Design a protein around this ligand. Structure first.
Ligand SMILES: *[C@H]1OC[C@@H](O[C@@H]2OC[C@@H](O)[C@H](O)[C@H]2O)[C@H](O)[C@H]1F
Length: 207
C-alpha cells in the first residue's frame, strides 16, 4: 500500500497515482477508500491522487454529475496545491479546481472569468504547457483552472459545475480520462493527510 515512486493502480476502489519527475522524494500511503497520506521533500514536481480514471469514451455530461466531498490536513512548506485534478482527451486538457495552496496562489495568469459555487468564489484561468509530461507523452496542452479566492481544506466540490463554467467560457473539454482529489507540490517540501475523499457520480459513491 506504500508508494514512493511512479505508480498507477486501484486501491480500495479508487484509481490511485503517484507521479514525480526526477529529484527529491515522496511517500504516499494508501489508506481506506479515497484516503491517503502524502509527504514530499525537495522535489521538482510531484502529484499524489485518488479518484477515478475513465476509458476515454464519454464527455463529462455522459459520465454524469461528479461531486467530491473531502477533508485534508494540508501542510505545505512552499509551493503546493490541494485540488480536484484530472484530464480530458481529444482535446488533451489537464485541469485543476484549487481549494488551497501554499505560499503562491496559482496559476499566475489573467483571469478569464469567475464561478460562484460551493459557498466560494473561484477565478477561472487557462494556461499552456509546451512539450511537458502528460498522460499521453511529451505534449503541448492547455491547463484549465478554477482557483478559490480564499483557502479551505474541507468541503464539497461540485466538479461538473466547474466544467459547465469552463465550457461556457469556450474552454473546450474532451472525453473524460480522470477526476481526482489531488495534492501537488512544486520545488518544495511538505505533507498532507487526506482523511476524507468520496467521489460521487450521479450521487453514488465510488466502490
Ligand atoms: C500537470 O501535472 C503534472 C503533469 O502531469 C503528469 O504528466 C505525466 C502523467 O504520467 C501523470 O499522470 C500526470 O499527472 C503535467 O505536465 C502538468 F501539466
Amino acid at each position: 500500500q506504500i508508494v514512493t515512486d511512479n505508480s498507477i493502480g486501484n486501491h480500495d476502489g479508487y484509481d490511485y497515482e503517484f507521479w514525480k519527475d526526477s529529484g527529491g522524494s515522496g511517500t504516499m500511503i494508501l489508506n481506506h477508500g479515497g484516503t491517503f497520506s502524502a509527504q514530499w521533500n525537495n522535489v521538482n514536481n510531484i502529484l499524489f491522487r485518488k479518484g477515478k480514471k475513465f476509458n476515454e469514451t464519454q464527455t463529462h455530461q455522459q459520465v454524469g454529475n461528479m461531486s467530491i466531498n473531502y477533508g485534508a490536513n494540508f501542510q505545505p512548506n512552499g509551493n503546493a496545491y490541494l485540488c480536484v485534478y484530472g484530464w480530458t482527451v481529444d482535446p488533451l486538457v489537464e485541469y485543476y479546481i484549487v481549494d488551497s495552496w501554499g505560499n503562491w496562489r496559482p496559476p499566475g495568469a489573467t483571469p478569464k472569468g469567475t464561478i460562484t459555487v460551493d459557498g466560494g468564489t473561484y477565478d477561472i484561468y487557462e494556461t499552456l504547457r509546451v512539450n511537458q509530461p502528460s498522460i499521453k507523452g511529451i505534449a503541448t496542452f492547455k491547463q484549465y483552472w478554477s482557483v478559490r479566492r480564499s483557502k479551505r481544506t474541507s468541503g464539497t466540490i461540485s466538479v461538473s459545475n466547474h466544467f459547465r463554467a469552463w465550457e461556457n467560457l469556450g474552454m473546450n473539454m474532451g472525453k473524460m480520462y480522470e477526476v481526482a482529489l489531488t495534492v501537488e507540490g512544486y520545488q518544495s517540501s511538505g505533507s498532507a493527510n487526506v482523511y476524507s475523499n468520496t467521489l460521487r457520480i450521479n450521487g453514488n459513491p465510488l466502490s
